[PDB]
């Protein structure tokens, strides 16, 4: 048993990185947007990947992290690295 990562606390760890929080609302369909579509810049992206690590324990690897495009692909991939341990 351990904490998952979830839609809300991924919603949440993009904002408490970045704050931005004019024009760009989480509040709705992110998921399926971009990155750059819900306006978070790719060092701001990073920055929240650090509060993942730091939540949850984990660690994102340097090949796979640029691999990504969507909050979806990143929350399935975490989520699963989480499956593969027992």
């Keep these: 048993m351990a904490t998952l990562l979830t839609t809300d606390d991924l919603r949440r760890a993009l904002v408490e990185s970045a704050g931005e929080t004019d024009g760009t609302?989480?509040?709705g369909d992110f998921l399926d947007?971009?990155?750059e579509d819900i306006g978070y810049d790719s060092?701001?992206?990073?920055?929240?990947?650090?509060?993942?690590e730091s939540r949850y324990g984990v660690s994102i690897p340097d090949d796979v992290?640029?691999?990504?495009?969507?909050?979806?692909?990143?929350?399935?991939?975490?989520?699963?690295?989480?499956?593969?341990?027992?």
């Design 43 to 52: 060092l701001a992206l990073m920055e929240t990947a650090a509060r993942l």
């Design 25 to 27: 609302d989480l509040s």
């Design 65 to 86: 992290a640029g691999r990504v495009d969507t909050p979806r692909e990143l929350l399935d991939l975490i989520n699963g690295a989480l499956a593969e341990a027992a």
């Design 33 to 35: 947007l971009r990155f």
